[PDB]
């Protein structure tokens with residue numbers, strides 16, 4: 471059971487290239503729970519970080535990380551603390567949630583993510599947001615708006631070239647537009663943790679934003695492919711990947727941050743961006759505050 | 765939810781919490797225990813987890829009564845000692861991490877818990 475020792479499963483091109491209708495997701499072990507040593511979200515976030523450890527993430531000094539949906543019913547934020555454990559010590563963590571909570575982030579903003587004003591461009595976006603009304607399933611599974619509209623605009627405007635995103639989706643909490651935006655990164659997948667393998671949950675990963683269409687994606691068809699993959703793939707609940715944490719911390723890559731105009735972005739720059747070796751954005755001081763909306 | 769509202773009805777939240785759990789009250793739950801390689805230095809508060817084999821590491825904000833209860837921190841600098849950092853708790857005291865931090869102090873020269881690691 472080698473896959474039990476990996477942090478999870480990543481959607482393969484075998485299923486990315488399929489052409490099927492959107493079917494209902496039917497998992498054999500649906501909603502089964504694995505006992506923890508420790509909140510389950512500790513193991514879920516660590517396994518997400520472990521998979522990102524195998525991705526070409528840009529890791530600069532003063533790394534700008536925003537974490538949406540960081541709170542919980544208990545008023546605490548296990549995922550943010552895992553991000554603190556994982557990220558460089560000088561990384562800037564901003565987290566946010568509709569409801570009040572306390573966390574180990576540098577900046578914590580309460581309220582709807584739409585109230586979160588990002589003054590500059592960030593390097594990594596983690597979203598665990600999920601709207602409770604998604605459970606009121608009625609008449610066919612259509613693309614959702616909700617916080618996905620905000621996240622799509624963020625990718626197009628407030629994400630550094632070379633930056634990455636990890637955005638939680640489920641069978642019914644997903645967005646056509648977000649899938650299609652994955653074609654603007656050097657690479658993309660959906661990653662499902664072994665700790666929560668019994669859920670249709672997956673983290674839609676966009677690795678190294680390029681600001682331009684690299685892959686033309688039919689977002690509706692691709693979600694149908696994602697569900698096709700989940701329906702075809704046995705996934706055993708496991709946290710074996712967390713037994714050896716000797717190399718858990720994100721590699722201190724010292725990724726450079728450069729300011730370039732659009733005209734200067736040649737093939738060399740695009741190559742460096744695609745390899746996780748470059749970020750293009752401002753290098754001022756990060757300003758992320760709560761906006762007063764109308 | 766009961767003990768947190770208890771420390772909001774008094775001028776000494778530290779004493780109010782300690783008196784509560786010393787009189788049999790249930791310690792505050794949902795402290796964020798981390799999974800760590802038990803190969804750390806063992807200091808009290810650290811930027812990364814530093815648990816030894818006899819310790820467990822918690823997210824700092826979650827074991828701070830003033831953070832958990834959303835009350836003013838007593839530090840004259842206004843900045844919390846634990847928030848944004850990791851706190852090592854002796855394994856025999858994980859039943860009440862919030863109570864442990866209120867009852868103990870790190871060695872200001874040595875950075876280890878006095879009585880739980882400090883050798884000065």
Ligand SMILES: C[n+]1cn([C@@H]2O[C@H](COP(=O)(O)OP(=O)(O)OP(=O)(O)OC[C@H]3O[C@@H](n4cnc5c(=O)[nH]c(N)nc54)[C@H](O)[C@@H]3O)[C@@H](O)[C@H]2O)c2nc(N)[nH]c(=O)c21
Nearest residue numbers: 495496497500542600604605607640641642643669670671
């Ligand atoms: C995949 N599936 C869906 N349904 C039906 O689809 C409807 C919409 O699904 P939906 O998109 O929520 O997705 P899932 O329920 O995975 O999300 P799941 O709840 O994991 O996760 C959704 C959100 O809940 C959060 N969450 C779920 N459990 C917990 C928990 O125990 N603690 C905390 N704190 N959060 C939880 C989770 O993190 C995420 O934010 C659901 O109501 C299903 O009944 C299925 N029915 C059967 N029989 N078999 C299935 O395989 C199946």
Ligand SMILES: C[S@@+](CC[C@H](N)C(=O)[O-])C[C@H]1O[C@@H](n2cnc3c(N)ncnc32)[C@H](O)[C@@H]1O
Nearest residue numbers: 511539540541548549567568582583598599600
């Ligand atoms: C599964 S929980 C987050 C669990 C958390 N990541 C952890 O580490 O335990 C889903 C969170 O999404 C938050 N959320 C949902 N919609 C949101 C929105 N529109 N803006 C900000 N937060 C939102 C919910 O309030 C809830 O706290």
Ligand SMILES: [Zn+2]
Nearest residue numbers: 828830831844
């Ligand atoms: Zn505090």
Ligand SMILES: [Zn+2]
Nearest residue numbers: 871874882884
């Ligand atoms: Zn000492």
